Design a protein around this ligand. Structure first.
Ligand SMILES: [Fe+2]
Lengths: 88, 58
């Protein structure tokens, strides 16, 4: 399993421009945790074969995923929007 | 660290299809985009095929 601080910083470098309300990787990870722990209305969910849970809110266009123990994998805004969600 | 990155093919991925970011080529290991290599606009802006084409020039 990838080292978590590096996973968080790498995802913040890649996706931070999608979340200009946040200024650092810690705020980004906090926001991902908060999103999947207290999903806003309209957040849809799916489970993957390894126990990961996927989250997608079409209103904000926010996708995120976490493993079976709640460790975030990623959070981003897919350019394809709901079409991305309906592909899995 | 022992699965191939779907873009560059080097063994950098720990858990396949779990959105790890390859340290060599920058590809985020999105399973929708490896299952459909022409699908742009998931975790990565380019499709997998676009990212492989670009990387093979690099
Ligand atoms: Fe790679």
């Amino acid at each position: 399993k990838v080292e978590p601080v590096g996973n968080a910083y790498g995802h913040w470098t890649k996706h931070g421009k999608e979340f200009p309300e946040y200024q650092n990787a810690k705020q980004y990870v906090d926001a991902a945790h908060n999103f999947m722990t207290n999903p806003p209305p309209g957040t849809l969910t799916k489970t993957r074969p390894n126990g990961d849970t996927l989250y997608y809110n079409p209103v904000t266009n926010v996708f995120a995923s976490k493993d079976i123990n709640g460790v975030p994998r990623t959070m981003f805004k897919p350019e394809k929007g709901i079409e991305y969600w309906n592909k899995q | 660290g022992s699965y191939p990155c779907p873009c560059c093919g080097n063994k950098t991925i720990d858990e396949p299809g779990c959105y790890e970011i390859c340290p060599i080529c920058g590809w985020e290991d999105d399973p929708v985009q490896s299952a459909d290599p022409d699908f742009s606009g998931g975790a990565n802006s380019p499709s997998l095929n676009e990212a492989k084409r670009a990387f093979n020039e690099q």
